[model samples]
Target: LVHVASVEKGRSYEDFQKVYNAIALKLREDDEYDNYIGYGPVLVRLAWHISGTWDKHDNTGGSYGGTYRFKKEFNDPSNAGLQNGFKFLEPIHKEFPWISSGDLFSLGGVTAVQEMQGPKIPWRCGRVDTPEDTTPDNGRLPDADKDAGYVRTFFQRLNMNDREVVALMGAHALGKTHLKNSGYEGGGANNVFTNEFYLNLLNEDWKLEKNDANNEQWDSKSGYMMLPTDYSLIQDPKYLSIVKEYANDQDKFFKDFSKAFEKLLENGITFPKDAPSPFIFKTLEEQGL
Candidate 1:
């Protein structure tokens, strides 16, 4: 049950940087995906889905296993639309066959966030692949139809507090919900990572309405939407306070989100005293590429 960090044989920061550059270049080239919102959002979602399975008590399912590649996790109703992200990384994995699936998937997210103008998420290598049987069963991921209380209680399994929960939900700004993917839909999809999600939550005139899937979602006349779970941040006063803080301060939101997201992805693994320090990757723009 104790998964330790084990660097890929003979691999180091430079090798992983090459992988990051490849994913970043492909992200630039594959600009037509999802109506030009690109692969960034899905890649972030893919990383989250893979990591979100952690159960802090038993330490069973988590990002350490790389189990999303298995049938059950891939077919997880919660993961309905993430195949695109997997496909996006297929060639990258082929080129760097030594890298573990968990690393590639989680790093895909870090790459996407930074390449899309998000914060620098310091990432560490070494999440070895476990057997398919080690794949956590489906239903561990959060649901979109729930409220603030449910969101609070659900994240507890992963040991995330109110500030962490609100910060992580900021990811909602990057992508729209597809009705087919989660029975909720409608949003002005955006690929950039910013405080816009928190801003929209506080500023939008949201009306409770039934979507095409017959599920309730808060819809704004400006062509944006919020899932019940997303709306819960404002519904709970404690979460609302954190939400407001994030909405008002861009730098604070980025810093909090970077720490919380890195923790979310690293929930189940134990890094040894000698494990390499986390690597902060350079964006393609930084390299002038």
Candidate 2:
């Protein structure tokens, strides 16, 4: 049940930094994808989705397995647009062949966040590649067609509380829900990493409407949309308070989100007490990119 990281031989922080730089450079180069939103949003989403399958109860289906490469996990309905993220990382995997699939998938996310100017997320890499049989069965990820009560119960599977759940949802700011991809559409700042999600949730005059996909979504003329689950944050009193905090305080949101996201990525995996301290890489900007 304990899943300590088996460090890649002869690799250190700089090696991973090089890999991060490669991903960032490609992000900048591949500007034509996702309506100029680039690969950033999907990469972060892919990282979360891969990690999201973990069942804290039995420690199954986590990012530690890297089983998303298998057919079933790759084909999970909940993972529909993430193939873009997987394709984006394909070259990086070839270049850094020593890195395990789980580490590479999660690291792609860290690179995207830092490159997009989000907060520093300390990352520790050691996930070894597991076989196809370890991939989780579908239906573990949260559903967008749900309410606050459902959101609360769903996150408990990952041991997340209200504040942490609110913080993680803040990630929705970076990507739009495509009608074809998830039966929802419209979103703000599809590339920048900020607390715009909370701002939109609190400030927008969102109307309930059915998109072409015939699913109910909160739509705004600003070309933004909120899933039922996203709207649930404000409807629930417990989640609304944290939403207000994040909406009002950008620094607090980023800090809390950094902590929550790292915890989310590490869920259901065990790390050795002496595992090398989590590493915070200098951003592409900080590195003078």
Candidate 3:
């Protein structure tokens, strides 16, 4: 199950940067989708969902295969609502068909995060598109109904520890759950990426409720919600400490999240030490867009 990525020949940092700008510009231009929720959050979620299927122990799934493009992986119940992200990236993929599916998918996330003023996630290329048979079976991704222990155990499959788990969950600050998609609702800002997720987790007075979808979620008067896995950040003593740290220091959160996310994307892929270093592209704002 070890995937050694074959570098896309005749490509380099500048080539990837061009693709990054394309993703970023499209994100800016298509600003009104999902009631102005925009494409950034979903793009990041799409990247993570594709990568989240990895099991570090066996090295299957993960961003290395780009198997999410296959029917079985795309139709996984956990991937509901992600078709939006895929459709958003469709034209970009058409424009840059040279890029590997895994690379383009993960790059969409890096572009989305940076364009939204989040951290700079260093990214490496060379994930060749895998065959349909390489797609991992459904059910590897974590469930939203899970408790703290379940959350911890679920992430352990990806070789993530408490700090990395807490850091990765901080991404919830960006998007709200669609009642039709995740059986939950209410999260604020919907687009802006920041440490507000940890801040809200710490500051909000959340009440548990059974939604119309018949699933339990934590809700607040400010129109925010946290899944049981998110609530686990506070319920678990170790995760709670990290949550408090991230809520208190945005820079630290950004730094830790950048590393954890990079690790998450790289998991289950075998990159030769001689491969090109991960690239950090300039943001659209940085380029004076």
TM-score top scorer: 1
Taking the tens digit of each residue's C-alpha lDDT, what string does model 1 give over 1-289?
7999899999989999999999999999999998899999999999999999999999999899899999999999999999999999999999999999999999999999999999999999999999989999999998888899999999999999999999999999997888888898857899999999999999999999998889999999999999999999999999999999999999999999999999988989999999999999999999999
Model 1 lDDT-worst window of ten: 179-188
- The numbered model that scores best in lDDT is 1
Per-prediction TM-score to the true structure, in the order listed: 0.99, 0.98, 0.98
lDDT pick, better of 2 and 3: 3
Predicted structure 2: clash tally: 0
lDDT of 1 at 43: 98
- Per-residue lDDT value at 14 in model 2: 94
1 or 3, greater by lDDT? 1
Q: Global CA lDDT of candidate 3, please?
A: 0.91
lDDT of 2 by residue, 21-93 (tens): 9999999999989788899999999999999999989899888989999999999999999999999999999
- For model 3, the superposed segments whose C-alpha errors exceed 4 Å read none
Candidate lDDT scores, in order, read 0.95, 0.90, 0.91
Model 3 C-alpha lDDT per residue in residues 111-130, reported as the tens digit of each score: 99888889899999999888
